[PDB]
Amino acid sequence: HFYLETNCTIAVPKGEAGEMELFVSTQNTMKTQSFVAKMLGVPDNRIVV
Amino acid sequence: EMGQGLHTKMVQVASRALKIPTSKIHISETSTNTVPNTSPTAASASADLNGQGVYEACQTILKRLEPFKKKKPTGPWEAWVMDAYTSAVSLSATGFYK
Amino acid sequence: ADELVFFVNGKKVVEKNADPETTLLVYLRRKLGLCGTKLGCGEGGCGACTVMISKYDRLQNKIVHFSVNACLAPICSLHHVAVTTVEGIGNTQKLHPVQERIARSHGSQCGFCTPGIVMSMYTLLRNQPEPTVEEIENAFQGNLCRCTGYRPILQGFRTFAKPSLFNPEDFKPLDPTQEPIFPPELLRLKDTPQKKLRFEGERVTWIQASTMEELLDLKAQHPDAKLVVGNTEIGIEMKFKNMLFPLIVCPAWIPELNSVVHGPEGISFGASCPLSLVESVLAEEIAKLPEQKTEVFRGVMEQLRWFAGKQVKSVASIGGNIITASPISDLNPVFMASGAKLTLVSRGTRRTVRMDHTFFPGYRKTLLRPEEILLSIEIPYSKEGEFFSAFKQASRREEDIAKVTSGMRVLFKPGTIEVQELSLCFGGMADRTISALKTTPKQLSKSWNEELLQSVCAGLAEELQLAPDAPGGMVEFRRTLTLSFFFKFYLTVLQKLGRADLEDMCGKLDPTFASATLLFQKDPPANVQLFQEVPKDQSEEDMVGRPLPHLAANMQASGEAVYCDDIPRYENELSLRLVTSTRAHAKITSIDTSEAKKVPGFVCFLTAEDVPNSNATGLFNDETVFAKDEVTCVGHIIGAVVADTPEHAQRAARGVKITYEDLPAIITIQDAINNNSFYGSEIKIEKGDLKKGFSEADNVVSGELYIGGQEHFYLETNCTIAVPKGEAGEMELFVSTQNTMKTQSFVAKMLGVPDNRIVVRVKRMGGGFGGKETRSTVVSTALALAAHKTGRPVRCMLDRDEDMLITGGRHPFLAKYKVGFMKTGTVVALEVAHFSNGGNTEDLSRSIMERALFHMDNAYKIPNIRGTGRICKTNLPSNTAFRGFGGPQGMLIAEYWMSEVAITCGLPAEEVRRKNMYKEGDLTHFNQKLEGFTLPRCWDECIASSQYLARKREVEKFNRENCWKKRGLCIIPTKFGISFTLPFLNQGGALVHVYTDGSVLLTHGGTEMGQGLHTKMVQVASRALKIPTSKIHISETSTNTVPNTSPTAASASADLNGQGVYEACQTILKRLEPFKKKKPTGPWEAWVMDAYTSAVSLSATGFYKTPNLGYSFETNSGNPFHYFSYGVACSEVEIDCLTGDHKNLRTDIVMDVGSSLNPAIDIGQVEGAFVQGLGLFTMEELHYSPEGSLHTRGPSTYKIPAFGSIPIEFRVSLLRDCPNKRAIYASKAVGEPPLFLASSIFFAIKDAIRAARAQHGDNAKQLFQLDSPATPEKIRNACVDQFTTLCVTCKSWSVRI
Amino acid sequence: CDDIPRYENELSLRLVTSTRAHAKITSIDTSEAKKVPGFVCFLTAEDVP
Ligand SMILES: Cc1cc2nc3c(=O)[nH]c(=O)nc-3n(C[C@H](O)[C@H](O)[C@H](O)COP(=O)(O)OP(=O)(O)OC[C@H]3O[C@@H](n4cnc5c(N)ncnc54)[C@H](O)[C@@H]3O)c2cc1C
Ligand code: FES
Ligand code: FES
Ligand SMILES: [Ca+2]
């Protein structure tokens, strides 16, 4: 692909109820959210992309 | 947005749908907590899918403003909106397309 | 050396460059990132910063633990100590029992006080694993909570001592072996000897002295070197009076300053001994020694009872109190009256003195030479025939500054009642602790009798006279207290002489006088919470109407809940400090920033010039962002310093020098009346025929009432972070606000960008109470500007002194009433003219006056009625919304004249109120019909369940058998209209998403400030969707998910947002039903995935407007309210007629909250609101200089209810079987309506004072004046007697606003 | 993404990848990594919640 911006994620944990906000260079916010939530074992509603 | 000018096209679409200048419409970002369960931006399809989404949301807002437009057919956009707000009319809407 | 080494939650901290100005609180939060520990005040009064310290004590040879205020502990005092914070004891993955119990017992609302309270309780348990009830209450003298009304905290923690809202049986047991180990390294180091340390900061050098020799050497070589022990005085001087001591010596380690030696004449305390140690050894001594030897000891104990809390007394030294030489020291009068022996030393010198008037030669001065330190105090044994009393009267009992304080000593010639020695010493009566040296000599060789009483009183009234302009004012009260305290001591001595078989010489005490001399004791508390069970058939997953704890209570108990300032700083983030006028009205002639520019890290000073677009803000556009050309109050924001750190911004702000030319100032309501200075025109409601009403009236009573305002005292002050995004003027703000919409609008207008660029986010507030409905924007706009200008994130959290000055409060009210009534008590006519003091800016002032007028009836039908309001425009900080919003003021006036109706008629108040009460179907003075009028049931339930009638008789009996204490009892109703007085604000919105795992993310326009709104909305959505609450999450409130939201205010927010949520949920259900129809059992998660894979939208908005609202002042027609709240409270008090102190003995409340959405949250709101009302009407008083400068700027002077303030017996019932079908799931709003029911305490006090005036007044005026707040001053002054008589006799400390 | 300012307490991650096309992992030694200043942790499959 050679997108001039490579893959990049900032994840910011909010310290309550497994809440986390991610800033991502992605075309797919939904799968990002889903994959993060499943890995951590928290509902999708805790994870913002 | 990845360089393909999608937000630009969606603002152009919204501006036509609402009959207001592009300058009054802003897109800031994409987030899972404003629109959930989104397909990837792919298959070249994103302006088609989201354009419809956007158009429908704009149709809902127009439907809600039309009584205020009827009673003030020349008065500016701003007067219709402020009239709707002080009449406790919702100025937020979702839009969807399949 | 120079490394500082200590432990935090078991982890070693090595600080190589400790700055002596660094507090523990700032180190924990900003250096270690542990933000569980909060800033509430910076003054030691609120306890939000409470943490635990452990050390190996070398003198007692064991591990000790005590609590401290982190806000006042210098890290440089903490070498080889172990700190435990809220994070150190547990977390939501494994809560400590203390955390669990406060959460589950509904003991956490906004949550901001919870860590500090957790740490107080935790520390007590580390010292005493089986405390008493009494020990549990005593642990919180230093902790304030503004939300809970304290009852649930004590009730949950009582389980550690010795249907249902919570189940104590499910609480996990305490295992003390699982507490954190004492860091083993510190145990190894108590072997090696401690050597002197030096720490060098930006401006301050700190020496930790290891030996007496080092301390004396240093003081000889450099007498400028400032002794710091507990820092509980020096911390206040440095933080608030901007005093810099560039060389500090801490002698806390020195054995000689910490020793306790028993000698023949008494007990010697090293001068650095903490007051907690004095307390413990004196309690041992008085327990085990004969009473005749411990009179002075018990006098010191009596003062230490009411002396701050555990946190302060742990580190505050006796020596520090003595040398501080405050006029209001509670200990110096006792040490002076008892001739306590002080040993002073310098390098190679040593002298002993007995404290007497010479020890204190001038304001905050002592006998010490610059190079001398106090080594020790001997507190003496009392002798045979020697008796002692100590006294203190403040505004509040616990952790308060004494008005008058006193030690008193008599010695009798052996075998006689003849005086050999007499010593009466006082604080609060001059610029130092004084002895009544002219009065007491005249008494030597007199017998202890009535004429000695009269002589000492005449002498005191003459010797201790007061200057009208005397610091503090309250000159009559203070003088009355010196006589009244003497009188108690006189009676006490009569009794003690009795106990020594000298009854025949001095006489017996009259038994009706005996209660005068009792030392304060409270009965054990007894609480009742009654509410309705939900139906039997209600699903266990449907939580509507069940007592679900606040969703965030566990996280609040654990310190994991994030408030604004807990958010980590960006690496490039700057700090802002506001710069305010020190003048009430003046021209700004110039600004000089020379000194500001020199402070390291200074970035800029923002002023009106830097505003990009409009300098005009506020709800009615009459406010400046930054002052231009003139200032119009003390606290008017002139500009803002931006710097790297908050400390550099504070210093830089000090170096902004403003020059002023005074202009004529309008301060008071009277001033505004004289000057025709008002916000808009007169507001008026009138019905019937006044002239006719007053003609037909058997009786007509006229009067005035003044009601003081109120500071919100949210435990979290105003705070904004503004994050600029560098594109298209986009900015995101994190704000402690109730009003995201106005925050956003005001920032956008100021910047000159559209609203669509500006996002305002609120996760939660640590209280709001109306104070964050508009006045938060004054910080938000300034930070936004800073952020736009620098392109960097900028943050500002106000200090408590700043917040109290800038952000205004409840509106003071003055009312002039005239009521006409029949001999039966039936009122036929009423005219009331209301005036409010609005301050600097219009803000919500006019709406507040409207609401007061809508409630001038309270519960009563008045056929002929006229009410007017005028809002005064004055050179004071702008006043705003406060829970009640003008209702409490309006209704207190109504009850005030109603009290006088009852007394004029000679009829029971109870019967007079009931007779006048509205009936179902009646119209108000504003022509709204009362339907579903529940007030009579509330009344009849309350009169019956409180046993009001049988208690009346007990009160009457008490009053006949006691001359110097009196009880009062009153039952008060309330009607409170629900909805914003501006109709279109009665709207709310929501947005819901369902993700493909079935989990639901919900948001609405309402903000969480501790009222349990998110909890309720989750309860509501869970019922609407028919899924468990566990699948539903609310993360925050934001302008970019729900736009155009009204403020969280008018108690309306659950009603509005509830409907919005319900409608969003109904849209989702409609879209799912085909999938539900095809698979009527297959779970929720399958319907959701089925809808997704069929491309059905799983996102919806929801919206609601309250229908049919809109009142006209012109036609007196249309409904302002959607429905009304109703309730009744019965309160009993016992006043001390000699001091003006009182106990709240018992309160019973019946409250109509319809079918409660959550009885736990709702009883919480009733108690919290009631207790704020209690403060409003009896304890909370703001004082201003005649030039309009707020003096009262922290908890030291502003006394909100404490744990020990609440009714000793406190019963709350929610009315059963009263569904309100027009609000969400037949609930009613709860936040504001109960507050005015604390009125019941005000009118109980008024009854008790009436009983005092019949006992002791001459031809005492029948309709006597009691303004609000009914403070000890006003209560004492109104109890006219022989003592007030000899004390009665325009430039002064304060002016009535 | 990477233009967003770092939080003061923000950490950096770097992935460790296979140098073999198909192999068993017989061991992982983290000794040397632990000596690098500012090292916080090495995440592996065991750290996944
Ligand atoms: C919330 C709060 C509530 C309070 N309530 C009360 C109250 O009800 N009644 C009351 O009387 N006080 C009250 N105080 C004041 C408190 O008791 C004093 O601040 C305390 O005793 C001072 O002791 P310290 O060790 O903290 O003094 P520091 O602040 O460390 O020192 C204070 C002064 O004493 C000097 N000093 C200390 N030790 C010596 C020594 N050995 N020789 C010579 N000079 C010395 C210091 O140089 C300094 O001038 C309160 C304070 C707070 C913060
Ligand atoms: S912040 Fe420390 S006592 Fe209030
Ligand atoms: S819950 Fe205690 S101050 Fe808010
Ligand atoms: Ca105002």
Coordinates of C-alpha atoms in Angstrom, one line a residue, chain C residues 389-712:
Chain C
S389 CA -14.2 25.4 83.5
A390 CA -13.3 26.0 79.8
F391 CA -15.8 27.4 77.3
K392 CA -15.9 28.0 73.5
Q393 CA -18.7 29.3 71.4
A394 CA -18.3 29.3 67.7
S395 CA -20.8 29.2 64.7
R396 CA -20.7 25.4 64.6
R397 CA -19.6 22.9 67.3
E398 CA -17.0 20.8 65.4
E399 CA -13.8 22.1 63.6
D400 CA -14.7 25.9 63.9
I401 CA -13.0 29.1 64.9
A402 CA -14.0 30.3 68.4
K403 CA -15.9 33.7 68.7
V404 CA -15.3 33.8 72.4
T405 CA -13.2 31.1 74.2
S406 CA -12.3 31.1 77.9
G407 CA -10.5 29.3 80.7
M408 CA -11.8 30.0 84.3
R409 CA -10.2 29.1 87.6
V410 CA -11.2 29.6 91.3
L411 CA -9.3 28.5 94.4
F412 CA -11.0 28.6 97.8
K413 CA -9.4 29.2 101.2
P414 CA -9.4 25.7 102.8
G415 CA -12.7 24.9 104.6
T416 CA -14.4 28.0 103.1
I417 CA -16.3 29.3 100.1
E418 CA -14.1 32.4 100.2
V419 CA -12.0 33.2 97.1
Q420 CA -8.2 32.9 97.5
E421 CA -7.5 33.1 93.7
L422 CA -9.7 33.9 90.7
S423 CA -8.6 33.8 87.0
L424 CA -10.9 34.5 84.1
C425 CA -9.1 34.5 80.7
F426 CA -10.6 35.0 77.2
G427 CA -9.9 34.7 73.5
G428 CA -11.9 36.5 70.8
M429 CA -12.3 39.6 72.9
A430 CA -9.1 41.5 71.8
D431 CA -6.0 41.1 69.6
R432 CA -4.6 38.6 72.1
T433 CA -5.5 36.2 74.9
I434 CA -6.3 38.5 77.9
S435 CA -7.0 38.1 81.6
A436 CA -9.7 40.1 83.3
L437 CA -7.1 41.6 85.7
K438 CA -9.1 44.6 86.8
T439 CA -12.2 42.5 87.6
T440 CA -10.9 39.4 89.5
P441 CA -8.8 41.2 92.2
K442 CA -12.0 42.9 93.6
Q443 CA -13.3 39.4 94.3
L444 CA -10.5 38.1 96.6
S445 CA -11.8 37.1 100.1
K446 CA -15.5 37.4 98.9
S447 CA -17.8 34.4 99.5
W448 CA -19.1 32.5 96.4
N449 CA -22.6 34.1 96.3
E450 CA -25.2 36.1 94.4
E451 CA -23.3 39.5 94.9
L452 CA -20.0 38.0 93.6
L453 CA -22.0 36.9 90.6
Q454 CA -23.3 40.5 90.1
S455 CA -19.9 42.1 90.8
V456 CA -17.9 39.9 88.3
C457 CA -20.6 40.4 85.7
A458 CA -20.6 44.3 86.1
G459 CA -16.7 44.2 86.0
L460 CA -16.6 42.0 82.9
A461 CA -19.1 44.2 81.0
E462 CA -16.8 47.3 81.8
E463 CA -13.3 45.7 81.4
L464 CA -14.0 43.7 78.2
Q465 CA -15.8 46.5 76.2
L466 CA -15.9 46.4 72.4
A467 CA -15.2 48.8 69.6
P468 CA -18.1 48.9 67.1
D469 CA -15.4 48.4 64.4
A470 CA -13.9 45.4 66.2
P471 CA -12.5 42.6 64.0
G472 CA -15.4 40.1 63.6
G473 CA -18.3 42.4 64.6
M474 CA -21.0 40.6 66.8
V475 CA -20.1 42.9 69.7
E476 CA -23.4 42.4 71.8
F477 CA -23.2 38.6 71.4
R478 CA -19.5 38.4 72.3
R479 CA -20.1 40.5 75.4
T480 CA -23.2 38.5 76.3
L481 CA -21.1 35.3 76.0
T482 CA -18.4 36.5 78.5
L483 CA -21.1 37.1 81.1
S484 CA -23.0 34.0 80.2
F485 CA -19.9 31.8 80.4
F486 CA -19.0 33.3 83.8
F487 CA -22.6 32.5 84.9
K488 CA -22.2 28.9 83.9
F489 CA -18.9 28.7 85.8
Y490 CA -20.6 30.4 88.9
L491 CA -23.3 27.7 88.9
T492 CA -20.8 24.9 88.2
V493 CA -18.8 26.0 91.2
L494 CA -21.9 26.2 93.4
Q495 CA -22.5 22.5 92.4
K496 CA -18.9 21.5 93.0
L497 CA -18.9 23.1 96.4
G498 CA -22.1 21.1 97.0
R499 CA -20.1 17.9 96.2
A500 CA -17.5 18.9 98.9
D501 CA -20.3 19.1 101.7
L502 CA -20.4 23.0 101.7
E503 CA -24.0 23.0 100.5
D504 CA -25.0 24.8 103.7
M505 CA -22.6 27.7 103.2
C506 CA -23.1 28.4 99.4
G507 CA -26.7 26.9 99.1
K508 CA -28.3 24.3 96.8
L509 CA -28.7 25.0 93.1
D510 CA -32.4 25.5 92.1
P511 CA -33.2 22.2 90.1
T512 CA -34.5 24.3 87.1
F513 CA -30.9 25.8 86.8
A514 CA -29.0 22.4 86.7
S515 CA -29.3 21.9 82.9
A516 CA -27.3 25.2 82.5
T517 CA -24.1 23.5 83.6
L518 CA -24.2 20.2 81.7
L519 CA -21.3 19.5 79.3
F520 CA -22.5 18.8 75.8
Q521 CA -23.6 15.2 75.1
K522 CA -25.7 13.8 72.2
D523 CA -28.0 10.8 72.5
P524 CA -27.1 7.8 70.2
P525 CA -28.5 8.4 66.7
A526 CA -31.7 6.6 65.6
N527 CA -32.7 6.6 61.9
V528 CA -35.6 5.3 59.9
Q529 CA -36.0 5.1 56.1
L530 CA -39.4 4.0 54.9
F531 CA -40.3 3.4 51.2
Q532 CA -42.6 1.3 49.0
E533 CA -41.7 -2.2 47.8
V534 CA -42.2 -2.7 44.1
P535 CA -45.0 -5.2 43.0
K536 CA -44.4 -9.0 43.6
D537 CA -44.8 -9.6 39.9
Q538 CA -42.1 -7.1 38.8
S539 CA -39.2 -8.9 37.1
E540 CA -36.0 -9.0 39.1
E541 CA -34.2 -7.4 36.0
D542 CA -36.6 -4.5 36.1
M543 CA -34.9 -2.1 38.6
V544 CA -37.3 0.8 38.3
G545 CA -38.5 1.4 41.8
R546 CA -35.7 -0.6 43.4
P547 CA -32.9 0.9 45.5
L548 CA -30.0 0.3 43.0
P549 CA -26.8 2.1 44.3
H550 CA -25.3 4.9 42.3
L551 CA -23.6 3.3 39.3
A552 CA -20.3 5.0 40.1
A553 CA -20.4 4.5 44.0
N554 CA -17.7 1.7 43.9
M555 CA -15.4 3.8 41.8
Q556 CA -16.0 6.8 43.9
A557 CA -15.1 4.9 47.1
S558 CA -12.0 3.6 45.4
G559 CA -10.7 7.0 44.0
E560 CA -10.9 5.6 40.5
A561 CA -13.8 7.8 39.4
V562 CA -12.3 10.6 37.2
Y563 CA -13.2 14.3 37.9
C564 CA -11.9 17.0 35.6
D565 CA -8.6 17.8 37.4
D566 CA -7.9 14.0 37.7
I567 CA -7.5 13.9 33.9
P568 CA -3.8 13.6 33.1
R569 CA -2.1 16.8 31.7
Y570 CA -0.8 16.9 28.2
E571 CA 3.0 17.3 28.0
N572 CA 2.4 20.8 26.5
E573 CA -0.5 21.8 28.8
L574 CA -0.5 25.3 30.5
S575 CA -2.1 26.6 33.7
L576 CA -4.3 29.6 34.0
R577 CA -5.0 31.8 37.0
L578 CA -7.7 34.5 37.1
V579 CA -6.9 38.1 38.2
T580 CA -9.9 39.8 39.9
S581 CA -10.7 43.4 41.2
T582 CA -10.0 44.3 44.8
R583 CA -12.6 47.1 44.3
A584 CA -16.4 47.1 44.3
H585 CA -16.7 49.9 41.7
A586 CA -13.7 51.7 40.1
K587 CA -12.1 52.8 36.9
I588 CA -9.1 50.7 35.8
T589 CA -6.5 53.4 35.4
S590 CA -3.6 51.1 34.4
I591 CA -2.3 47.5 34.5
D592 CA 1.4 46.8 35.2
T593 CA 2.7 43.3 34.5
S594 CA 6.4 43.9 35.1
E595 CA 6.6 41.6 38.1
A596 CA 4.4 39.0 36.5
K597 CA 6.8 38.7 33.5
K598 CA 9.8 37.9 35.8
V599 CA 8.1 34.7 37.3
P600 CA 9.6 31.6 35.7
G601 CA 7.2 29.9 33.2
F602 CA 5.1 33.0 32.6
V603 CA 3.5 32.9 29.2
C604 CA 1.1 35.8 29.0
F605 CA -1.6 38.0 30.6
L606 CA -4.9 38.0 28.8
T607 CA -7.2 41.0 29.0
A608 CA -10.2 42.4 27.1
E609 CA -7.9 43.3 24.2
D610 CA -7.1 39.6 23.5
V611 CA -10.7 38.6 23.0
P612 CA -11.0 37.7 19.2
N613 CA -14.7 38.5 18.7
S614 CA -17.1 39.6 21.6
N615 CA -16.2 40.6 25.2
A616 CA -20.0 40.5 26.0
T617 CA -21.2 37.2 27.7
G618 CA -23.6 35.9 30.3
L619 CA -27.1 34.7 30.0
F620 CA -28.5 38.2 29.3
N621 CA -25.4 39.5 27.5
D622 CA -24.5 42.1 30.2
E623 CA -21.3 40.6 31.4
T624 CA -17.7 41.0 30.3
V625 CA -15.4 38.1 29.6
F626 CA -12.7 40.4 31.0
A627 CA -13.2 43.8 32.6
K628 CA -12.9 46.7 30.2
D629 CA -12.3 50.3 31.7
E630 CA -14.3 49.6 35.0
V631 CA -14.7 46.9 37.6
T632 CA -18.1 46.4 39.1
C633 CA -17.4 44.1 42.1
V634 CA -14.7 42.7 44.3
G635 CA -14.1 39.5 42.3
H636 CA -14.7 41.0 38.9
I637 CA -12.4 39.1 36.5
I638 CA -9.9 41.6 34.9
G639 CA -7.8 39.0 33.1
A640 CA -5.9 35.7 33.3
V641 CA -2.2 34.8 33.7
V642 CA -1.0 31.8 31.7
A643 CA 2.0 29.9 32.9
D644 CA 3.6 26.4 32.8
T645 CA 2.4 25.4 36.4
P646 CA -0.3 26.5 38.7
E647 CA 2.3 27.7 41.2
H648 CA 3.9 30.0 38.6
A649 CA 0.5 31.2 37.5
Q650 CA -0.4 32.1 41.1
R651 CA 3.0 33.9 41.6
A652 CA 2.7 35.7 38.3
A653 CA -0.9 36.7 39.2
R654 CA 0.5 38.4 42.4
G655 CA 2.7 40.5 40.1
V656 CA -0.1 41.9 38.1
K657 CA -0.6 45.4 39.7
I658 CA -3.8 47.2 39.0
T659 CA -4.4 50.9 39.7
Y660 CA -7.9 52.0 40.3
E661 CA -10.0 55.2 40.7
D662 CA -13.0 54.6 42.9
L663 CA -16.6 55.2 41.6
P664 CA -19.7 55.4 43.8
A665 CA -20.7 51.8 44.9
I666 CA -24.2 50.3 45.3
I667 CA -23.7 47.4 47.8
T668 CA -26.8 46.7 49.8
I669 CA -30.4 46.1 49.0
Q670 CA -31.1 49.5 50.7
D671 CA -28.4 51.1 48.7
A672 CA -30.0 49.8 45.5
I673 CA -33.5 51.0 46.5
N674 CA -32.2 54.5 47.3
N675 CA -30.5 54.6 43.9
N676 CA -33.3 53.0 41.8
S677 CA -30.7 50.4 40.7
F678 CA -32.7 47.2 39.6
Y679 CA -32.7 44.5 36.9
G680 CA -35.7 45.4 34.8
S681 CA -39.1 46.4 36.1
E682 CA -41.3 45.2 39.0
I683 CA -42.7 41.6 38.9
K684 CA -46.2 41.1 40.3
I685 CA -48.9 38.6 41.0
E686 CA -52.2 39.7 42.5
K687 CA -55.6 38.1 42.9
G688 CA -58.8 39.2 44.6
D689 CA -59.4 42.5 46.4
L690 CA -56.7 43.6 48.9
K691 CA -58.6 46.7 50.3
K692 CA -61.7 44.6 51.1
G693 CA -59.6 41.7 52.5
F694 CA -57.8 44.0 54.9
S695 CA -61.2 45.7 55.9
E696 CA -62.9 42.4 56.7
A697 CA -59.8 41.2 58.7
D698 CA -60.2 41.1 62.5
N699 CA -56.4 41.5 62.7
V700 CA -53.5 43.0 60.6
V701 CA -49.8 42.3 61.3
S702 CA -47.0 44.0 59.5
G703 CA -43.2 43.1 59.5
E704 CA -40.0 42.6 57.7
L705 CA -37.7 39.5 57.2
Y706 CA -34.1 39.3 56.0
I707 CA -32.7 36.1 54.6
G708 CA -29.0 35.7 54.1
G709 CA -27.7 34.0 50.9
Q710 CA -25.6 30.8 50.6
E711 CA -22.5 29.4 49.0
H712 CA -23.0 26.1 47.2

